[PDB]
Design a protein around this ligand. Structure first.
Ligand SMILES: NC(=O)c1cc[n+](CCCn2ccnc2/C=N/O)cc1
Ligand SMILES: NC(=O)c1cc[n+](CCCn2ccnc2/C=N/O)cc1
Lengths: 540, 540
């Protein structure tokens, strides 16, 4: 066997598996049940801890993916299907994974906890791009990742009722963090040095745990990659969440006409429907034709979030907190092929002036015609108002700034100015093996493979420079997980990474070149979104 | 006895004077009466042609300056005194001047006609900086300049009535243009090649003559320096012009206590007041505290201007017309010492953030608080939002773009796209003898001394490069007056001046260095004023 592939946790015994890397082996415990399967009468309900089990639970392979929509925009395409489920779908999906170095650390080791993205409607901890064997081997860290319910199963909310309170997907993540506090020591991990890190919707989830008191005590550092809780997509109002849950119920025949109405009968009817039936009508509850908008997201209910994320961020005291935030160079390009007219991954997407004006309404839905004109003014080069190439990158900036860059910059500034230690970055390396078209540049989500050391995989065709670049990034993330500072603790050889402040607004660029310090995360563009445009929407 | 100093015109005989230049003599005829003195019952009335005279009218010195306010912001300061009247004030001021080379041209010579600026409240053709002896000697053209009524005497308007119809100051300029058609041949000038050029309010006057059919037939080319007829200061509505005229009457005691206040009784009472009394209350009729706003300006009445200047520019056909437009580098800095808080010509004017916010309301009066927010958003460097130096240059840009640069670019683009050949420039050389503080850069109005060849005056302390630079500009202006093209017709050696088009938007920089082609007259900033802000005011 291996003596270290057998571990006892509070619920029972487990048997892991050894993973091979070019640098050495790693012990992995994949598919650990941390919650009772949220099935039958437990659909839409908060999770319960997994009851203890007899015998040895097999933890040698990833468990099922939570029921979710499957992307079909480009069948057979690597760029889209790398995010699709790689295990079979099931509501029995509340399982987590633990990577630990070999040999097992004898002293408490800092813990990294991954939260996958996917717009709160998709994602899985089993994706190949989340393989934590290279990050754990190269940095001797303990890596944990969990599955959480997405879509209606995780975020359908009838606010007020007990049958569908909403945010149960966030509670799934919290329970996995409580499991980490109670069991990560058995794997050699320090429960007093837990660093959350996630991307997109996962980064937004990490931010909502900062703003939730019960979750705040379960971790000590946070990393938010291309996402923030205060974005225009990460939360939804109580009234709007009720309308979508009612609309989804209507699309699946709930309630049976004309018997029913209240929330008890509505959720009871939803529980009888097969899981695939609810998924098949998920996108048909959104209010508009739009991109970067998702049907079932965290709801501002007063429970998990006592107020809106914007309100909690402004009134928050973040002393004793270290945050690492950042974005990719082209946040909006990935989302333009999902609705913006004239865009296609198979041509160069040289859109016309008319298509640009139409795409602004898709990228910025629910804004007055005056608000859209303010967006057109700010993102139009008036020396070349018709140039298709410039218009293509302009709409990409519109979607990326409105949804990612400016929500992140507003959070990074408020955190630093209110006690938190903040480090900011911009990822500017396009992978040599990237399958998306060249005009997308560095799309959203394609820094993850370098954070997890995927270039080190010998079965892949990365360059030698990308392998060294991946190791330097893993050093940054691990140093931040250990010390709270991505700079190497005793090393001025490489240039330093200065903290991000509300005044200087310093960040570093992450590419093959050495670190380069810059100032302002699109300060002029984000002043339009964060300062002026709210005033324009107030006076309709 | 020099027979060249004796000329007969349609009204009688004149005796001129010989003026000395380092390059040769020039025959000047200063103080030619072109209208009956608009005194007594003729105050506020359109001009009437000067009745023919017997004898020899002496034309050896400048005549009286029209009654106007005298600047007292900095007593004894060269930068302000140079614009103050240098002759006695009088309502008998409708006189013009003619410069002609020696010996007198035997072939019909193109004619330049100068229209001074001064916010329609001041100015005079007798100012030292308007001396035409150097431009006429170096380029052998015929230069004409006239006095026109300013302030209430030229632009007080009770629209509809016949006693104070308004725009009589513009009619003074037109009458002088009719005089050029009927008499410039006697001086060797060609009435079929007349080029207008004016600065600030003079440039706005040149623009309004283009938009007036009776004036359009009196000339063939136009030059507009740091001014346009479509600016927010060059015109006023009928209702506002009536309110200002009525309050001026009130401030001087018109009508008397217990007197009917119709237009006839109001003007009759105004005609009894000494001219200085009306001047002493001119600035007390502006609606609010502001800079770059003037009490009595051309009124949009349907007579001289059938519609607003912007409406006439949009619907205008300008085929067969050549226009030379341009601005100085720092159009707004000179006006900031006239009301903007924290500004002083005797310190660095390092204003605070609060003073910048207050100055925007002074530089942009009568705009909603939301409109002011949009101005601050566009002109704030959000990476250095409190830097006093940057805020100083920002408010200078706010005033310069809102009042000069963007009204000119709007005009230049519409002219080129609707039949006119347009040339654009930016004057970027700061005179070595400039008395204004260094932080004003190249202030508004300080390209005039180089256009008129003032550096060639031996009693001045200009540099050798400024003398060559002044000759370049006189050649540019003369080439445009002769051929409609500032480029040298016999030369491919020098850098060429490409026409300004609505698409490429090419202009040249005018300084000691050779010509440099650039694109866009502050295109991003002017799209805010010309495109977005009108949408913001319509939605309030
Ligand atoms: N069933 C459909 O016709 C359908 C429409 C839109 N979507 C949205 C695709 C996901 N998306 C939206 C904006 N950006 C994205 C990409 N996420 O990875 C999915 C399905
Ligand atoms: N008597 C006064 O208090 C008074 C107020 C304003 N002014 C206007 C000054 C001229 N001005 C104002 C803004 N821009 C200008 C242009 N100066 O050339 C003069 C006097």
């Amino acid at each position: 066997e291996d003596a270290e592939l057998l571990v006892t946790v509070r619920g029972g015994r487990l048997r892991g598996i050894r993973l091979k890397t070019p640098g050495g082996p790693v012990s992995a415990f994949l598919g650990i049940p941390f919650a009772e399967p949220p099935m039958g009468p437990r659909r839409f309900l908060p999770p319960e801890p997994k009851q203890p089990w007899s015998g040895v639970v097999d933890a040698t392979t990833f468990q099922s993916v939570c029921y979710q929509y499957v992307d079909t925009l480009y069948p057979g395409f690597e760029g889209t299907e790398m995010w699709n489920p790689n295990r079979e779908l099931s509501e029995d999906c509340l399982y987590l994974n633990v990577w630990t170095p070999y040999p097992r650390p004898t002293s408490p080791t800092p813990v990294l906890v991954w939260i996958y993205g996917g717009g709160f409607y998709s994602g899985a901890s089993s994706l190949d791009v989340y393989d934590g064997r290279f990050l754990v081997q190269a940095e001797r860290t303990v890596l944990v990742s969990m599955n959480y319910r997405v879509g209606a199963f995780g975020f359908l909310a009838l606010p007020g009722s007990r049958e569908a309170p909403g945010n149960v997907g966030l509670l799934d993540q919290r329970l996995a963090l409580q499991w980490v506090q109670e069991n990560v020591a058995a794997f050699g991990g320090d429960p007093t040095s837990v660093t959350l890190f996630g991307e997109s919707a996962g980064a937004a989830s990490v931010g909502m745990h900062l703003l939730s008191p019960p979750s705040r005590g379960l971790f000590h550092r946070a990393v938010l990659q291309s996402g923030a809780p205060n974005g225009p997509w990460a939360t939804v109002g109580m009234g709007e969440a009720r309308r979508r849950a009612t609309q989804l119920a209507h699309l699946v025949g709930c309630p049976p006409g004309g018997t029913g109405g209240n929330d008890t009968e509505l959720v009871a009817c939803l529980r009888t429907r097969p899981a695939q039936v609810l998924v098949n009508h998920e996108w048909h509850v959104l209010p508009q034709e739009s991109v970067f908008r998702f049907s079932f997201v965290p709801v501002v209910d007063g429970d998990f979030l006592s107020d809106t994320p914007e309100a909690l961020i402004n009134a928050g005291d973040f002393h004793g907190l270290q945050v690492l935030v950042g974005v990719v160079k082209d946040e909006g390009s990935y989302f333009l092929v999902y609705g913006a007219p004239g865009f296609s991954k198979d041509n160069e997407s040289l859109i016309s002036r008319a298509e640009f004006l139409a795409g602004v309404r898709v990228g910025v839905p629910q804004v007055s015609d005056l608000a859209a004109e303010a967006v057109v003014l700010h993102y139009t080069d008036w020396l070349h108002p018709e140039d298709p190439a410039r218009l293509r990158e302009a709409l990409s900036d519109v979607v990326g700034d409105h949804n990612v860059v400016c929500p992140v910059a507003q959070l990074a500034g408020r955190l630093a100015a209110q006690g938190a230690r903040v480090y900011a970055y911009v990822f500017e390396h396009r992978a040599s093996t990237l399958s998306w078209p060249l005009w997308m540049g560095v799309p959203h989500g394609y820094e993850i493979e370098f954070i997890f050391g995927i270039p080190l995989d010998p079965s892949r065709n990365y360059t030698a420079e990308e392998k060294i670049f991946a190791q330097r990034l893993m050093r940054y993330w691990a140093n931040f997980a250990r010390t709270g500072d991505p700079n190497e603790p005793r090393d001025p050889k490489a240039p330093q990474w200065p903290p991000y402040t509300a005044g200087a607004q310093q960040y570093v660029s992450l590419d093959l070149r050495p670190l380069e310090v810059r100032r302002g995360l699109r300060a002029q563009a984000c002043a339009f979104w964060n300062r002026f445009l709210p005033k324009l929407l107030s006076a309709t």
